[PDB]
Amino acid sequence: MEKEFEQIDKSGSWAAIYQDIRHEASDFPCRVAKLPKNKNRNRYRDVSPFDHSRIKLHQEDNDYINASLIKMEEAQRSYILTQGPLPNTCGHFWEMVWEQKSRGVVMLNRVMEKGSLKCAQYWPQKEEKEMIFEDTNLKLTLISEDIKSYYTVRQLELENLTTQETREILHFHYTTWPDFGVPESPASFLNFLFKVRESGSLSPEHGPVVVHCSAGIGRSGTFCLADTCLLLMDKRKDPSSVDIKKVLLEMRKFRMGLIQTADQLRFSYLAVIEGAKFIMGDSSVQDQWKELSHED
Numbered sequence: 001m002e003k004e005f006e007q008i009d010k011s012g013s014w015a016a017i018y019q020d021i022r023h024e025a026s027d028f029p030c031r032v033a034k035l036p037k038n039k040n041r042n043r044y045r046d047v048s049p050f051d052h053s054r055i056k057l058h059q060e061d062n063d064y065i066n067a068s069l070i071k072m073e074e075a076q077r078s079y080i081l082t083q084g085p086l087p088n089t090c091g092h093f094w095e096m097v098w099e100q101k102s103r104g105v106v107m108l109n110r111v112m113e114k115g116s117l118k119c120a121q122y123w124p125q126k127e128e129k130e131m132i133f134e135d136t137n138l139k140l141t142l143i144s145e146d147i148k149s150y151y152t153v154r155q156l157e158l159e160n161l162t163t164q165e166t167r168e169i170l171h172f173h174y175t176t177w178p179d180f181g182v183p184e185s186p187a188s189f190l191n192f193l194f195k196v197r198e199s200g201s202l203s204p205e206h207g208p209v210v211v212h213c214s215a216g217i218g219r220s221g222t223f224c225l226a227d228t229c230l231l232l233m234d235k236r237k238d239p240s241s242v243d244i245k246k247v248l249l250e251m252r253k254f255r256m257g258l259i260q261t262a263d264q265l266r267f268s269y270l271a272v273i274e275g276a277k278f279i280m281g282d283s284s285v286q287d288q289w290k291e292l293s294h295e296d
């Protein structure tokens, strides 16, 4: 894998390679997303979930949410990728989290980035001020938070007001990944990813983890591609066999535009190559990653 990386670097072909992927990517209808009644449920007019893989809310009125089920058969892991919720779709977001039985939510953006709103404040910032989503009959409370230098992990309590059932939802918020950009380092990215993994959130016993950024395709796609490739390396009898470009095209069958710049693609290669060290056994790389990430 690093041989291909090295030759892409020498040839200076990241852009051409990335554009080939965009050209070969699947094109499926998004008719439900484009219905006039769903216009205000979409943050961006050009980013819509394909009809075949969209997540359907269990409400009869309108079951539409800009969210997609990325089901990776060989890796044996599913993820739900969605846009940052809008002021009017936060209830829908939590209804999806509840109905799909997700245990973790991975957020890779900030509410405001460079002077622009990118996502509604869909969770409580203060313990004493819980949130009620009236349209969906759900209550959400901030139980605690572990704030790190570049990411924060939060314990949220989500309650179905109707049945009184409550669930602990873990929120993994990466706060320093710029839009259309990349993480500070493979180490910082991997330190975070393994925190999500170690939490049990990605376990097949739970529903799919919900991953989102602003549009739910650039940063979210980078995060899922690296996680999936590392999973495939650990699975197969020969990790060198993992073709990251093939994996990305496979993921793009479930949601459009995953990975938004040639450099996020190049970063994905670095993340997988670095993470592979842990998969192949190295028990000193993780601490290395933590030290390198300066999470304190």
Ligand SMILES: O=C1C[C@@H](c2ccc(C[C@H](NS(=O)(=O)c3cccc(F)c3)C3=NC(Cc4ccccc4F)=C=N3)cc2)S(=O)(=O)N1
Pocket: 044, 045, 046, 047, 109, 178, 179, 180, 181, 213, 214, 215, 216, 217, 218, 219, 220, 257, 260
């Ligand atoms: O690293 C990233 C990129 C962010 C991001 C990606 C796409 C968009 C959608 C934008 N839509 S628009 O209505 O603001 C907009 C802005 C400029 C030109 C244009 F035609 C529309 C967007 N579209 C292109 C990107 C693009 C191009 C073709 C098809 C689908 C696309 F998403 C660039 N930004 C917003 C944020 S993320 O939150 O997914 N992580």
Ligand SMILES: [Mg+2]
Pocket: 126, 127
């Ligand atoms: Mg306080």
